[PDB]
Design an enzyme around this catalytic site. Structure first.
Site, PDB file in Angstrom:
ATOM      1  N   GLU C  71      58.911 -12.958 -20.733  1.00 27.28           N
ATOM      2  CA  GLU C  71      58.840 -13.321 -19.320  1.00 27.28           C
ATOM      3  C   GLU C  71      57.911 -12.355 -18.594  1.00 27.28           C
ATOM      4  O   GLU C  71      57.738 -11.214 -19.035  1.00 27.28           O
ATOM      5  CB  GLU C  71      60.228 -13.342 -18.653  1.00 27.28           C
ATOM      6  CG  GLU C  71      60.980 -12.036 -18.664  1.00 27.28           C
ATOM      7  CD  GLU C  71      61.098 -11.396 -17.288  1.00 27.28           C
ATOM      8  OE1 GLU C  71      62.022 -10.552 -17.122  1.00 27.28           O
ATOM      9  OE2 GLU C  71      60.257 -11.709 -16.397  1.00 27.28           O
ATOM     10  N   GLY C 143      68.836  -7.096 -25.832  1.00 26.25           N
ATOM     11  CA  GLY C 143      68.142  -8.195 -25.208  1.00 26.25           C
ATOM     12  C   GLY C 143      67.797  -9.282 -26.201  1.00 26.25           C
ATOM     13  O   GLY C 143      67.768  -9.079 -27.416  1.00 26.25           O
ATOM     14  N   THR C 145      64.843 -11.081 -26.333  1.00 19.49           N
ATOM     15  CA  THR C 145      63.523 -10.746 -26.851  1.00 19.49           C
ATOM     16  C   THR C 145      63.600  -9.514 -27.736  1.00 19.49           C
ATOM     17  O   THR C 145      63.292  -9.575 -28.935  1.00 19.49           O
ATOM     18  CB  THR C 145      62.554 -10.509 -25.699  1.00 19.49           C
ATOM     19  OG1 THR C 145      62.491 -11.693 -24.915  1.00 19.49           O
ATOM     20  CG2 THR C 145      61.156 -10.187 -26.198  1.00 19.49           C
ATOM     21  N   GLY C 146      64.090  -8.409 -27.170  1.00 12.43           N
ATOM     22  CA  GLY C 146      64.037  -7.151 -27.865  1.00 12.43           C
ATOM     23  C   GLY C 146      64.755  -7.165 -29.190  1.00 12.43           C
ATOM     24  O   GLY C 146      64.372  -6.438 -30.110  1.00 12.43           O
ATOM     25  N   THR C 179      73.500  -5.636 -19.734  1.00 12.78           N
ATOM     26  CA  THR C 179      73.274  -6.838 -18.938  1.00 12.78           C
ATOM     27  C   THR C 179      73.903  -8.092 -19.546  1.00 12.78           C
ATOM     28  O   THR C 179      73.670  -9.201 -19.034  1.00 12.78           O
ATOM     29  CB  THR C 179      71.772  -7.070 -18.779  1.00 12.78           C
ATOM     30  OG1 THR C 179      71.175  -7.100 -20.084  1.00 12.78           O
ATOM     31  CG2 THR C 179      71.133  -5.953 -17.975  1.00 12.78           C
ATOM     32  N   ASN C 206      72.179   4.230 -24.873  1.00 12.77           N
ATOM     33  CA  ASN C 206      72.106   4.350 -23.426  1.00 12.77           C
ATOM     34  C   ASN C 206      73.308   5.102 -22.852  1.00 12.77           C
ATOM     35  O   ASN C 206      73.172   5.754 -21.813  1.00 12.77           O
ATOM     36  CB  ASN C 206      71.965   2.974 -22.811  1.00 12.77           C
ATOM     37  CG  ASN C 206      70.526   2.620 -22.512  1.00 12.77           C
ATOM     38  OD1 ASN C 206      69.649   3.479 -22.512  1.00 12.77           O
ATOM     39  ND2 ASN C 206      70.271   1.341 -22.254  1.00 12.77           N
ATOM     40  N   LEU C 252      52.862   9.020 -40.732  1.00  9.61           N
ATOM     41  CA  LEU C 252      54.104   8.252 -40.725  1.00  9.61           C
ATOM     42  C   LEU C 252      54.830   8.308 -42.063  1.00  9.61           C
ATOM     43  O   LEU C 252      56.065   8.230 -42.098  1.00  9.61           O
ATOM     44  CB  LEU C 252      53.817   6.804 -40.355  1.00  9.61           C
ATOM     45  CG  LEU C 252      53.345   6.610 -38.928  1.00  9.61           C
ATOM     46  CD1 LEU C 252      53.033   5.144 -38.712  1.00  9.61           C
ATOM     47  CD2 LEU C 252      54.380   7.136 -37.923  1.00  9.61           C
ATOM     48  N   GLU C 254      55.161  10.836 -43.797  1.00  8.00           N
ATOM     49  CA  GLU C 254      55.873  12.103 -43.838  1.00  8.00           C
ATOM     50  C   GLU C 254      57.227  12.004 -43.152  1.00  8.00           C
ATOM     51  O   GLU C 254      58.165  12.691 -43.568  1.00  8.00           O
ATOM     52  CB  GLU C 254      55.022  13.203 -43.209  1.00  8.00           C
ATOM     53  CG  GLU C 254      55.553  14.596 -43.461  1.00  8.00           C
ATOM     54  CD  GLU C 254      54.522  15.664 -43.170  1.00  8.00           C
ATOM     55  OE1 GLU C 254      53.317  15.318 -43.197  1.00  8.00           O
ATOM     56  OE2 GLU C 254      54.918  16.834 -42.909  1.00  8.00           O
TER      57      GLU C 254
HETATM   58  N1  LIG Z   1      67.197   2.752 -21.726  1.00 10.13           N
HETATM   59  C1  LIG Z   1      66.766   1.596 -21.240  1.00 10.13           C
HETATM   60  N2  LIG Z   1      67.482   0.458 -21.526  1.00 10.13           N
HETATM   61  C2  LIG Z   1      67.085  -0.735 -21.041  1.00 10.13           C
HETATM   62  C3  LIG Z   1      65.953  -0.838 -20.250  1.00 10.13           C
HETATM   63  N3  LIG Z   1      65.805  -2.144 -19.915  1.00 10.13           N
HETATM   64  C4  LIG Z   1      66.815  -2.847 -20.486  1.00 10.13           C
HETATM   65  N4  LIG Z   1      67.624  -1.978 -21.169  1.00 10.13           N
HETATM   66  C5  LIG Z   1      68.822  -2.257 -21.972  1.00 10.13           C
HETATM   67  O1  LIG Z   1      68.484  -3.274 -22.900  1.00 10.13           O
HETATM   68  C6  LIG Z   1      69.532  -4.205 -23.011  1.00 10.13           C
HETATM   69  C7  LIG Z   1      68.979  -5.508 -22.453  1.00 10.13           C
HETATM   70  O2  LIG Z   1      67.816  -5.794 -23.197  1.00 10.13           O
HETATM   71  P1  LIG Z   1      66.374  -6.132 -22.546  1.00 10.13           P
HETATM   72  O3  LIG Z   1      65.239  -5.383 -23.199  1.00 10.13           O
HETATM   73  O4  LIG Z   1      66.345  -5.907 -21.039  1.00 10.13           O
HETATM   74  O5  LIG Z   1      66.223  -7.711 -22.869  1.00 10.13           O
HETATM   75  P2  LIG Z   1      64.875  -8.401 -23.422  1.00 10.13           P
HETATM   76  O6  LIG Z   1      64.405  -7.784 -24.710  1.00 10.13           O
HETATM   77  O7  LIG Z   1      63.830  -8.363 -22.328  1.00 10.13           O
HETATM   78  O8  LIG Z   1      65.292  -9.900 -23.865  1.00 10.13           O
HETATM   79  P3  LIG Z   1      65.407 -11.131 -22.819  1.00 10.13           P
HETATM   80  O9  LIG Z   1      65.349 -10.597 -21.382  1.00 10.13           O
HETATM   81  O10 LIG Z   1      66.728 -11.792 -23.198  1.00 10.13           O
HETATM   82  O11 LIG Z   1      64.204 -12.044 -22.950  1.00 10.13           O
HETATM   83  C8  LIG Z   1      70.699  -3.638 -22.223  1.00 10.13           C
HETATM   84  O12 LIG Z   1      71.475  -2.811 -23.074  1.00 10.13           O
HETATM   85  C9  LIG Z   1      70.041  -2.743 -21.195  1.00 10.13           C
HETATM   86  O13 LIG Z   1      70.915  -1.683 -20.846  1.00 10.13           O
HETATM   87  C10 LIG Z   1      65.220   0.307 -19.963  1.00 10.13           C
HETATM   88  O14 LIG Z   1      64.206   0.221 -19.261  1.00 10.13           O
HETATM   89  N5  LIG Z   1      65.636   1.533 -20.460  1.00 10.13           N
HETATM   90 MG   LIG Z   2      63.655  -9.774 -20.364  1.00 13.20          MG
END
Ligand SMILES: Nc1nc2c(ncn2[C@@H]2O[C@H](COP(=O)(O)OP(=O)(O)OP(=O)(O)O)[C@@H](O)[C@H]2O)c(=O)[nH]1
Ligand SMILES: [Mg+2]
Ligand SMILES: Nc1ncnc2c1ncn2[C@@H]1O[C@H](COP(=O)(O)OP(=O)(O)CP(=O)(O)O)[C@@H](O)[C@H]1O
Ligand SMILES: Nc1nc2c(ncn2[C@@H]2O[C@H](COP(=O)(O)OP(=O)(O)O)[C@@H](O)[C@H]2O)c(=O)[nH]1
Ligand SMILES: [Ca+2]
Ligand SMILES: [Ca+2]
Ligand SMILES: [Ca+2]
Ligand SMILES: [Cl-]
Ligand SMILES: [Mg+2]
Ligand SMILES: [Mg+2]
Ligand SMILES: [Mg+2]
Lengths: 54, 428, 438, 351
Positions: C71, C143, C145-146, C179, C206, C252, C254
């Site tokens: 997004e 997340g 995505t993540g 979230t 976190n 890397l 190492e």
């Molecule tokens: N430490 C830290 N945690 C983050 C941050 N942004 C999101 N989070 C954490 O990441 C998790 C949510 O994942 P996100 O990365 O925001 O989600 P995403 O990968 O964008 O995936 P979608 O939004 O579902 O498309 C939760 O545990 C949040 O607390 C950040 O900037 N710093």
């Molecule tokens: Mg997102």
């Protein structure tokens, strides 16, 4: 307690201190997994629209 | 995931929908001509979620107005914010629906729904990324009930991958237009269970009691009931309307709130409770907000949360206040009442804060619970249904429009299944 | 010199990459427009900061970075913020609709439509590399995505760049800032599908960063900005040996050789001292002994566990600032006497040490005070498996009732992948227990 | 209202601690697997310390110390005393003990065991040993011991039998002393002022070793194989006033000088040794624990540590008091509500 492999340079130094010695899947297997999931999706969507057609 | 399409159907649907657009336009600094006159630019950062941008940088609600008769929609057109609506988005027949689900769903409504879908498609094609739809309606009349569930079926046909969200007013004898209301509600609940992703159960019983017992209004009008509903709707959509971390679109909210597809009937609540005149001036403290928002008497669906267990909770705090204090308070309500939160969904209370408070208040809290206590609501409807249906009373009004008793029997069955599915998880 | 490509995926990944690249430019004296007055080899070179920056004919130093989010708003803030000029547009990839905290939505549904675009923008950077070491992948477990897209990306990186090493900086979910309710699902799922594709992973809980901020930064309720500047400090400690002259962790490979003797147990604990509030009026600066001692307090770890009830397989100490070997050995000697440090019987009981003489750089107007000396310790202790225990427990609690599973199956996932992932995690937990308990 | 959970229901002590906790009206029990508790009264084996200390808004506390099993398994205790410089193989209050594995398995100091026993063979010293790990045996020649060890499956310790025990008269019989130690969240070591002498009821007989009722003082054993059980003291249990009066009348000492000084020394040396490995001072959850220290008094009024128990039961009459003591100093000291029965063991000698 021996210091070993010590290296130095203008910006730092690094060493080791020893206290005691010792006592994948392929490209198309993947596009397979992804297309199996897409077909599962389209099957569920089709059953949804057949129910709505009834 | 940006634009939402808003549909309001029927008398109740359109009266509360009109109040909703008045309230949130005032929050977003938009006047009855669609001119923006605001102070903070947090007001416009996500205003395209609910408004299209027009030629003189004017703002048009993404709003379709649907009725089977023109009375109420005429009054909205001349209401204080009436001229802000796209005039082509008013779509109405002449017949009326006679408090009759079957006219809404099968006969009178069938005639009109294709034009409603034309306007809906015209709004959808303009969206850069459509999130889905929110419908306001009651389930006890005919247009909102029957035609609104018709519309939901067609929309799910044409947009099966978008979120369907409703605000659905349930009927109560305490506030009651006609005796066939349980019939209309049961039919409609059967559609809602299968065709919507998240439904806010706004019980007219609870609105009556809040107006009567705590707000001390002796003879509550639909105006007093809609005041509560406008404020609750504002609150349950604030996370969608302002920059935000949490439950910030319809789908993420659904993922957070709906652990099982059919159990998507939410119990909303509001604190502090306001009577539209008294203007009361006391500072509400965060522990007070938190204790109130969780209290049954601030909840719009007449159920006792202590008769069930929370599957998920979404809390929203509005105003300048200490997020340390609200974090502390939220954990203290869950830690001292942990019995009432299912232990097999960890960390099921999620909490959001937004800087801008609603009009009239420095601080405010909106509550959205997916409680299994909601079964109580449906059980009540079903009793009122059976009392009539076991003598097949009033059925002619429906069978005259082509309906069979067996449809009524299916709808009853599916609601009683819904309540058993709610009680499966209340003992787990 | 051999180049590293950083890939930041999702909100958490992009926001942390923002923080780290800010930091890196401060440390290397690169300014927001990308100019480096200290680099006199104009237009290129093979200095070791070139490991992370490429150079253009005009004197611009460009991160070897790709940002990918499903997004647009977060990467839009990158495109428009203070380092707008640093990055070329082709390095910033947005979708239109995100993954709604749904692993399956990010991996299967939406991943499929953007994976090829991402691999091409990555190939474009790799084509500007004379010798590419591999990848630094920044992302969250929680997340959509993540978690989901990252795992797809990692599978395809192992095929497209099979001989290259891949490192993760993974953000582990904490309720105080999380979230979504299904974050344990997402975590297990992506750990299971990424485990064999990643050679070394640095988890950051976190919850630990949050409490470090509260307790030692006097921050009442930390934001992601507070969290991320601390996290980037630690990341820069961990990568300084790729970006600077030295003889410890120069590449890397190492990192794996030094911190990971068994490939699945590839989750080193990071401990970092000192974290000192910039608003502290009077601060007595800490000795080598005091900060190395802090390295063995759980309150200073990126994951809260107890290394006393585990075993070590490796321990690196990365000092930054005014540190000389004799003080480090003095500190280690007395710390071993007063502390429960026990390695596995098949591994030397030792410490590889790295010192860079430049003290930690801290972001102007940040929360962190400048100090004369600081250390990041990387220790592969089995006690980090506590964090898996936690996660797995939560997972079991929900999946026993199949709560929320329908959101995954409706994206095209199969219920059974839930339990294949959970059983992989069971294997993982018991690997740790074999190696570190008796 | 504080909240607690119970995951050991076979616990005599913490059952009464639950009861007393509830009857405050400031504590509410939750169900076994609910996370949002202030206090865990946990299971014995496989207690999940990894899940404690991670629920925001809840100071969490648990009635066990992670890693204290090192002191409460027999083999672990032998290894801890021998390896740790603060106690050492020179230790004066622990019997000569050796860790022996059955050859069914294959570390082990059997070779080291027989050298000591051979110079005691050769030196005309008494040389009876006990083998321990219900499964004990006492004998003067080594072969007996080792092959008994191996026709069982698991790891044993072999320890010098105290050949000259102090014997109460009337009876000419044996006894052991059990002391109840409570270590709170700050690592104060509280000794409970009431200990108990688990006695034997059959006269001590140095010749015929295999008759284990005159040699083993377990409350189990003398309620099952003993003729006189209950003759001299109720439940084969003499308490501290009677034992003190006997020491005064018969030996001219008191219990505190002749025995208790040594017991306090042993308790504090043992716990202050493991302190850096189990302390929860700066951790994200906190531990306390009730231990039961078991001692033997030889005829010269010298105390020996027998074993340490991590999940001890209390003698009946004392429950009420000791359990209240666990609430006041271990629990309510962390979780406040709206004459003391412990000696705090502390000693800072300068050198
Ligand atoms: N430490 C830290 N945690 C983050 C941050 N942004 C999101 N989070 C954490 O990441 C998790 C949510 O994942 P996100 O990365 O925001 O989600 P995403 O990968 O964008 O995936 P979608 O939004 O579902 O498309 C939760 O545990 C949040 O607390 C950040 O900037 N710093
Ligand atoms: Mg997102
Ligand atoms: N080295 C030794 N010398 C002489 N007698 C010994 C001895 N070790 C044990 N005993 C005797 O055996 C008994 C102790 O057995 P043991 O030490 O194994 O306790 P236990 O584990 O069987 C049950 P509990 O935990 O309730 O004490 C003591 O009462 C003592 O009389
Ligand atoms: N809360 C609220 N309920 C209403 C309002 N108007 C009608 N109702 C309820 O809605 C039901 C009647 O449905 P209605 O909308 O009037 O009929 P329709 O136009 O055919 O859908 C009854 O249960 C009324 O209590 C209103 O303004 N507010
Ligand atoms: Ca007609
Ligand atoms: Ca250069
Ligand atoms: Ca590989
Ligand atoms: Cl390759
Ligand atoms: Mg048409
Ligand atoms: Mg009406
Ligand atoms: Mg025992």
């Amino acid at each position: 307690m021996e210091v070993i492999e010590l290296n130095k340079c203008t910006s730092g130094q690094s060493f080791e201190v020893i206290l005691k010695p010792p006592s994948d899947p392929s490209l198309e297997e993947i596009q397979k997994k992804l297309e199996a999931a897409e077909e599962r999706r389209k099957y569920q969507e089709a059953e949804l629209l057949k129910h709505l057609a009834e | 995931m940006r634009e939402i399409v808003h549909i309001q159907a029927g008398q109740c649907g359109n009266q509360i929908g009109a109040k909703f657009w008045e309230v949130i336009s005032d929050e977003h600094g938009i006047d009855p001509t669609g001119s923006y006159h605001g102070d903070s630019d947090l007001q416009l950062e996500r205003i395209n979620v609910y408004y299209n941008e027009a030629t003189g940088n004017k703002y048009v609600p993404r709003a379709i107005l649907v009725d089977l008769e023109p009375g109420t929609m005429d009054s909205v057109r001349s209401g204080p914010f009436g001229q802000i609506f796209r005039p082509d988005n008013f779509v109405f027949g002449q017949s009326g629906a006679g408090n009759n689900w079957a006219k809404g769903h099968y006969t009178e409504g069938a005639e009109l729904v294709d034009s409603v879908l034309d306007v809906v498609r015209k709004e959808s094609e303009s969206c850069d990324c459509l999130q889905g739809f929110q419908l306001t309606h009651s389930l006890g009349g005919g247009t909102g009930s029957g035609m609104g569930t018709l519309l939901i079926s067609k929309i799910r046909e044409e947009y099966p991958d978008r979120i369907m969200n409703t605000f659905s007013v349930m009927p109560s004898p305490k506030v009651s237009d006609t005796v066939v209301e349980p019939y209309n509600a049961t039919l409609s609940v059967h559609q809602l269970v299968e065709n919507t992703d998240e439904t806010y159960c706004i019980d007219n019983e609870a609105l009556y009691d809040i107006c009567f017992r705590t707000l001390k209004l002796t003879t509550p009008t639909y105006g007093d009931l809609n005041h509560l509903v406008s404020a609750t709707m504002s609150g349950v959509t604030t996370c969608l309307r302002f920059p935000g971390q949490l439950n910030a679109d319809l789908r993420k909210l659904a993922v957070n709130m709906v652990p099982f597809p059919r159990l998507h009937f939410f119990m909303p609540g509001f604190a502090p409770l306001t009577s539209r005149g008294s203007q009361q001036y006391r500072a509400l403290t965060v522990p007070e907000l938190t204790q109130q928002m969780f209290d049954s008497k601030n909840m719009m669906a007449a159920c006792d949360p202590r008769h069930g267990r929370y599957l998920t909770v979404a809390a929203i705090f509005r105003g300048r206040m200490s997020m340390k204090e609200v974090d502390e308070q939220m954990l203290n309500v869950q830690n001292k009442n942990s019995s009432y939160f299912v232990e097999w969904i960890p960390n099921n209370v999620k909490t959001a804060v937004c800087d801008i408070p609603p009009r009239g208040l420095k601080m405010s809290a909106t509550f959205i619970g997916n409680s299994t206590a909601i079964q109580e609501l449906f059980k009540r409807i079903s009793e009122q249904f059976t009392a009539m249906f076991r003598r097949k009373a009033f059925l002619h009004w429906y069978t005259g429009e082509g309906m069979d008793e067996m449809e009524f029997t299916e709808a009853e069955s599916n609601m009683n299944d819904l309540v058993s599915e709610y009680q499966q998880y209340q003992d787990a | 010199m051999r180049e590293c490509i950083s890939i930041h995926v999702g909100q958490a990944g992009v926001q942390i990459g923002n923080a780290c690249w800010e930091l890196y430019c401060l440390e290397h004296g690169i300014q927001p427009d990308g100019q480096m007055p200290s680099d006199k080899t104009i237009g290129g070179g093979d200095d070791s900061f070139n490991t992370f920056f490429s150079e253009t004919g005009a004197g611009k130093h460009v991160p070897r970075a790709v940002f990918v989010d499903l997004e647009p708003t977060v990467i839009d803030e990158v495109r428009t913020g203070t380092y707008r000029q640093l990055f070329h547009p082709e390095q910033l990839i947005t979708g239109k609709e995100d993954a709604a905290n749904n692993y399956a939505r990010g991996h299967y549904t939406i991943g499929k439509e953007i994976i090829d675009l991402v691999l091409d923008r990555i190939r474009k950077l790799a084509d500007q590399c004379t010798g590419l070491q591999g990848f630094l992948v920044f992302h969250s477990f929680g997340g959509g995505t993540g978690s989901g897209f990252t795992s797809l990306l990692m599978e395809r990186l192992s095929v497209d760049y099979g001989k290259k090493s891949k490192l993760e900086f993974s953000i582990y979910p904490a309720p105080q800032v999380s979230t979504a309710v299904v974050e344990p699902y997402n975590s297990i799922l992506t750990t299971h599908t990424t485990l064999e594709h990643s050679d070394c992973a640095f988890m950051v809980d976190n919850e630990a960063i949050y409490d470090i901020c509260r307790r030692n930064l006097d921050i009442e309720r930390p934001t992601y900005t507070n969290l991320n500047r601390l996290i980037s400090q630690i990341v820069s400690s961990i990568t300084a040996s790729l970006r600077f002259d030295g003889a410890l962790n120069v590449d890397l490979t190492e990192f794996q050789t030094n911190l990971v003797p068994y490939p699945r147990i590839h989750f080193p604990l990071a401990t970092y001292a000192p974290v000192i509030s910039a608003e502290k009026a009077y601060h007595e600066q800490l000795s080598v002994a005091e900060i190395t001692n802090a390295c063995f307090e759980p309150a200073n770890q990126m994951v809260k566990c107890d290394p006393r009830h585990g075993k070590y397989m490796a321990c690196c100490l990365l000092y930054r600032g005014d540190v000389v070997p004799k003080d480090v050995n003095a500190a280690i000697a007395t710390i071993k006497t007063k502390r429960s440090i026990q390695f596995v019987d098949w591994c030397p009981t030792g410490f590889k040490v790295g010192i860079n003489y430049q003290p930690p750089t801290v972001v102007p107007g940040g929360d962190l005070a400048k100090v004369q000396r600081a250390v990041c310790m990387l220790s592969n202790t089995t006690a980090i498996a506590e964090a898996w225990a936690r996660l797995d427990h939560k997972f079991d609690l929900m999946y026993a009732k199949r709560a929320f599973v329908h959101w995954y199956v409706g994206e095209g996932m199969e219920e059974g992948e839930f339990s294949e992932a959970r059983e992989d995690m069971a294997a993982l937990e018991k690997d740790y227990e074999e190696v570190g308990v008796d | 209202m504080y909240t607690f959970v119970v995951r050991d229901e076979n616990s005599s002590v913490y059952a009464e601690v639950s009861r007393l906790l509830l009857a405050t009206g400031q504590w509410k029990r939750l169900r076994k697997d609910n996370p949002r508790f202030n206090l865990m009264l946990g299971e014995r084996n496989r207690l999940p310390f990894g899940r404690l200390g991670h629920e925001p808004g809840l100071v969490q506390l648990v009635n066990y110390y992670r890693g204290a099993d090192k002191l409460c398994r027999k083999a672990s205790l032998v290894k801890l005393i021998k390896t740790s410089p603060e106690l050492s193989e020179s230790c004066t209050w622990f019997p000569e003990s050796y860790v022996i594995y059955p050859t069914n398995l294959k570390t082990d100091e059997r070779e080291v065991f027989l050298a000591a026993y051979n110079r005691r063979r050769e030196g005309r010293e008494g040389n009876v040993w006990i083998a321990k790990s219900e499964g004990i045996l006492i004998s003067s020649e080594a072969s007996e011991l080792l092959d008994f060890i191996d026709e069982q499956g698991q790891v044993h310790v072999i320890q010098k039998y105290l050949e000259k025990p102090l014997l109460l008269e009337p009876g000419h019989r044996k006894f052991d002393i059990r002391s109840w130690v409570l270590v709170d969240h700050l690592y104060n070591i509280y000794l409970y002022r009431e200990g108990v002498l688990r006695t034997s009821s059959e006269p001590y007989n140095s010749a015929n070793f295999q008759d284990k009722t005159c040699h083993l003082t377990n409350h189990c054993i003398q309620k099952e194989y003993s003729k006189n059980y209950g003759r001299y003291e109720e439940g084969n249990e003499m308490f501290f006033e009677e034992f003190n009066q006997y020491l005064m009348d018969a030996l001219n000492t008191t219990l505190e000088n002749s025995i208790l000084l040594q017991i306090k020394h042993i308790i504090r040396s043992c716990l202050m040794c493991i302190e850096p490995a189990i302390s929860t001072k700066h951790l994200h959850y906190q531990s306390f624990q009730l231990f039961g220290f078991d001692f033997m008094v030889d005829e010269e009024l010298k105390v020996w540590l027998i074993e340490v128990n991590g999940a001890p039961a209390c003698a009946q009459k004392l429950y009420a008091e000791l359990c209240q003591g666990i609430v006041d100093v271990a629990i309510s000291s962390v979780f406040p509500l709206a004459t003391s029965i412990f000696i705090k063991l502390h000693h800072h000698h300068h050198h």
